[PDB]
Design a protein around this nucleic acid. Structure first.
Ligand SMILES: Nc1ncnc2c1ncn2[C@@H]1O[C@H](COP(=O)(O)OP(=O)(O)OP(=O)(O)O)[C@@H](O)[C@H]1O
Ligand code: SF4
Ligand code: SF4
Lengths: 608, 136, 118
RNA sequence: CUCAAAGAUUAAGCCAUGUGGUAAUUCUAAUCCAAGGAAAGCAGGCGCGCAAAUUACCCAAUCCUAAUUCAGGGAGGUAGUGAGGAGGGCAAGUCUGGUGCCAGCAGCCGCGGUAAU
């Protein structure tokens, strides 16, 4: 007959105020009219509760809700089979979990809110899964049963017995500074205590990670990239079998994230089990032997797929569709402009834009050098390189925030600027802040697509910025820079705290407005793909981090990309199906052939 | 060509006029494909419409699982035999005429493609790329 | 990574049945044969690595090769091979011609010799 | 309590997992693919159906395999899982309230159309 279906309702309490509506949910529902149970009022917490058993799937309640607090979805009973854990009534529920394997590295990739973080806790022994039920007083026993038919069953027996104690590298990057000071006192102390391994391990681990400078600094003092790496150090130093990493690429620069990936992989060689979660595909590919994909709506649900190969899992990810599950997880496919695709205009505007001379900025501990370059109108320039190179310093000077030690840049131009690390320091609510900058930008349809509808800022409008979240704040900041008119716009590292969909919304944003408005933009980035889409020229930075650095004039996309990628020595041939960068291993004949051609990347362009 | 064909296609010698039968080269259960129409073909009194490499045709299955017989469906030509000529100067030809049953969007009905597949078809129909072994 | 195999000719790769006692194949079981890919013995740019052996020294020194010189791990063990590696006659008696390898316990440095055979 | 049969009947149907190069094998001088190439035993799953259990422990026993030992062995052994009737033939007288050839009983014989053995 007909296929089977279900109803699931998740309500957000933040969005709900029963006083204004009245308990309208109960009154409007047709089941309750009849005298049924579908919506029950909880006198206590004073929240509406919707029971999935009695609900019709009508959706009448959803429309009537004045805010948009209720969500009812109909699924083919895809979710019911898999239930691992649920937070509570009408809240996030997790489905499936990632397999662990000894001697190898298993990847995880998904959009935020999927339960990748939750999954780690369950494997860690930190949290016990309720099984979408009562299971609470240590009922590890029931969890093995639920896992039967899955390879995780063996793991759960091991965890309960406590033969193995997993080491976890904590996920939330913002939270860590508050938790630890010193580790107690200074990063160096942490590394000495934790070092179960070789005395060589202390030195070796620090050298490879580029921690040398950072040892004396305290944890609270650390910058985001530095903060991440110390955590990684402790996860090598520890003695154990299972090493869990949760988002190790966060905050890190392009050079550093690759470095972290290699070191982490070394664990597999000692035949120690490794698990990892990543937002970055370049990093994910290198680390993993096996990959899981986590999909589903954010904060509603997230299911883990069956284990897959490294190459295979990545390929399926980019399609935006999964066949067994039969879900189009992402509404639109990701594509990069060919450069054939772009509009052809004679560019200058007023003959070229402004130009800067050689600049120098010296702190007295770090020195930045800049080579005279030129900027033109309606163009976009990417800035790449490792952090501590003075990528941030350079942008500031152009902003006029910083004064150069030598050189000068006094432009007539009006500048809008977005800072790299965003910490709130503005009193006021989110809507008020954005309205002051510009209203009318808020009216535009473009802004509805990218900001307002996806996150639901309407709910955020009353919330304080101190009270806010990381990724949500990021999209808002990028948009705000665009809020006001300026000849030149400056953005620094827009990719931070953002998942796949979120960054790509940003990529479309910068390119489209700049093209249209005929204004120029400088964007700093670590993400390969984001730079490619937005830019026409690039500046590459080089030197040694935390010591000195150098900048170059803007150069074409092909030219700049070869230089940058030559510093890394990883080529990204091309995958014929995905058109994705495909990484090339060191000493090789195929990779060797490329080195003689000068092609690090490939696109829909002519080339051998 | 048409729907789901991302890419354009450079002209290649027409090998297969209506009435032609090609080998079915998937694992769908179909043994052959009988061409009744070429998509995107034009009109001239008396001319048979005729397909080539990476053209979408409209076919019936003359030989094959009965659940596939007695009806018209889309297919895509994957190997030729009439020799044609590429822009690198080459005149080339396969040993058989063959295509694979497919949907208007261009998705394979089957999961494998047995034998080689000419690149001009691979380049044209991504789900055909997927299921192809040796290309060209 | 496929190894070349002397004698094939060909500048391509081919798959051959291989047997006990041969290049590019080590059998797991008695009388097992495997059909395996193998590279031709004719050099092409499809090679990652050429394997050469020096036959005549050139006019100049190559550092890690002519400058450095490396001891033959193990000495003669069978009687008459000791006799030959020293030229001896079935008169000279081996025992005090065998090699003697020193190796230390820390403050006890030792001395190990083979065990002559035949 | 001791003794323990057990997925054969359905589908001998299908199976997750337990000096140098190279994508990668115990590499070697219907699945993974750096597109080149390489790969019906225990438990346990799916399916199937009317129909059959655990991803456990162990060499102690019984013996087996390799050479003068005591190595190996899911052969094997321990555990886990895993017991209606009261009309007649039939033996009960069946008694009291509800039902009316509706609901239901009934292996057959037959019950049931307010006073139902
Ligand atoms: N205390 C809680 N109560 C209810 N639901 C919770 C709670 N903590 C987490 N969740 C739910 O679990 C899901 C989130 O977390 P997890 O931490 O599992 O996400 P991730 O999968 O790691 O995603 P992200 O990439 O965004 O960090 C969320 O969508 C949320 O709805
Ligand atoms: S969820 Fe909406 S309609 Fe229901 S009580 Fe809250 S505000 Fe009123
Ligand atoms: S969807 Fe319909 S049936 Fe379910 S709770 Fe809302 S109104 Fe009641």
């Amino acid at each position: 007959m007909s296929d089977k279906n279900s109803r699931i309702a998740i309500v957000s309490a933040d969005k709900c105020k029963p006083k204004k509506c009245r308990q309208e949910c109960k009154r409007s529902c047709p089941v309750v009219k009849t005298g049924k149970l579908c919506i029950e009022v909880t006198p206590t917490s004073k929240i509406a509760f919707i029971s999935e058993i009695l609900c019709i799937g009508c959706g009448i309640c959803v429309k009537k809700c004045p805010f948009d607090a209720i969500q009812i979805i109909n699924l083919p009973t895809n979710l019911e089979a898999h239930v691992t854990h649920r937070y509570s009534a009408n809240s996030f529920k997790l489905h499936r979990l990632p397999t662990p394997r000894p001697g190898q590295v298993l990847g995880l990739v998904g959009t935020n809110g999927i339960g990748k973080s939750t999954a780690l806790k369950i494997l860690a022994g930190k949290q016990k899964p309720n099984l979408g039920r009562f299971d609470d007083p240590p009922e590890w026993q029931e969890i093995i049963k639920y896992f039967r038919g899955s390879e995780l069953q063996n793991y759960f027996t091991k965890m309960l017995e406590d033969d193995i104690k997993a080491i976890i590298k904590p996920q939330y990057v913002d939270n860590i500074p508050r938790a630890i000071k010193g580790p107690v006192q200074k990063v160096g102390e942490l590394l000495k205590l934790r070092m179960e391994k070789s005395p060589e391990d202390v030195k070796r681990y620090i050298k490879i990670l580029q921690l040398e400078n950072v040892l004396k600094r305290d944890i609270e003092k650390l910058s985001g990239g530095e903060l991440q790496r110390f955590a990684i150090g402790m996860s090598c130093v520890q003695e154990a079998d299972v090493y869990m990493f949760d988002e190790p690429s966060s905050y890190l620069d392009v050079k550093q994230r690759l470095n972290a990936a290699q070191i982490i992989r070394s664990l597999l060689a000692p035949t120690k089990y490794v698990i990892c979660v990543e937002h970055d595909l370049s990093v994910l590919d290198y680390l993993s032997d096996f990959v899981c994909i986590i999909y589903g709506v954010p904060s509603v649900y997230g299911v883990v797929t069956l284990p897959a190969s490294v190459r295979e899992g990545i390929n399926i990810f980019l399609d935006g569709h999964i066949p067994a599950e039969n879900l189009r997880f992402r509404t639109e496919a990701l594509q990069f402009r060919i450069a054939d695709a772009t509009e052809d205009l004679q560019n200058d505007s007023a003959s070229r834009a402004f130009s800067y001379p050689s600049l120098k900025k010296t702190q007295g501990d770090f020195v930045l050098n800049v080579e005279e370059g030129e900027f033109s109108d309606s163009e976009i320039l990417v800035m790449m390189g490792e952090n501590g190179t003075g990528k941030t310093t350079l942008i500031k000077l152009l902003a006029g925030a910083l004064k150069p030690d030598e050189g000068q840049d006094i432009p007539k131009l009006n500048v809008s600027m977005k800072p790299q690390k965003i910490a709130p320091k503005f009193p006021g609510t989110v809507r008020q802040l954005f309205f002051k900058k510009i209203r009318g930008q808020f009216l535009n349809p473009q802004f509805q697509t990218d900001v307002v509808k996806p996150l639901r800022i309407d709910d955020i409008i009353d919330q304080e910025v101190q009270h806010l979240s990381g990724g949500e704040l990021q999209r808002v900041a990028i948009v705000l820079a665009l809020g006001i008119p300026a000849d030149i716009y400056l953005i620094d590292e827009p990719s931070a705290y953002l998942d796949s969909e979120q960054r790509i919304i940003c990529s479309k944003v910068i390119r489209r407005f700049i093209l249209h408005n005929k204004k120029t933009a400088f964007i700093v980035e670590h993400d390969f793909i984001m730079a490619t889409y937005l830019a026409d020229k690039v500046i590459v930075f080089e030197g040694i981090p935390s010591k000195n650095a150098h900048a170059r004039a803007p150069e074409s996309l092909l030219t700049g990309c070869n230089r940058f990628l030559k510093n890394l020595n990883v080529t990204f041939r091309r995958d014929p199906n995905s058109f994705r960068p495909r990484i090339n291993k060191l000493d090789s004949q195929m990779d060797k052939e490329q080195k003689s051609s000068g092609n690090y990347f490939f696109l829909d362009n002519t080339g051998i | 060509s048409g729907n789901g064909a991302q890419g354009t296609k450079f002209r290649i010698s027409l090998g297969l006029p209506v009435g032609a039968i090609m080998n079915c080269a998937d694992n769908s259960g179909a043994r052959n494909l009988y061409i009744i129409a070429v998509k995107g073909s034009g009109s001239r009194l008396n001319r048979l419409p005729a397909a080539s490499l990476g053209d979408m045709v409209m076919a019936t299955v003359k030989k094959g699982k009965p659940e596939l017989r007695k009806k018209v469906m889309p297919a895509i030509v994957v190997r030729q035999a009439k020799s044609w000529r590429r822009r690198d100067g080459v005149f080339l030809y396969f040993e058989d005429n063959a295509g694979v049953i497919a949907n208007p969007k261009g998705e394979m009905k089957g999961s494998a493609i047995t034998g080689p597949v000419g690149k001009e078809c691979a380049d044209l129909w991504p789900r055909v790329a997927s299921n192809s072994g040796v290309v060209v | 990574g496929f190894p070349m195999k002397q004698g094939v000719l060909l500048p391509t790769r081919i798959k051959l049945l291989l047997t006990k006692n041969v290049s590019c194949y080590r059998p797991r079981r008695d009388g097992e044969r495997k059909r395996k890919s193998v590279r031709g013995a004719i050099v092409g740019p499809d090679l990652a690595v050429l394997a050469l052996v020096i036959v005549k020294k050139g006019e100049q020194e190559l550092e890690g090769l002519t400058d450095t010189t490396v001891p033959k791990r193990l000495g003669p063990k069978r009687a008459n091979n000791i006799r030959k590696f020293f030229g001896l006659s079935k008169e000279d008696d081996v025992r005090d011609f065998v090699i003697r390898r020193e190796v230390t316990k820390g403050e006890k440095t030792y001395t190990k010799a083979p065990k002559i055979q035949r």
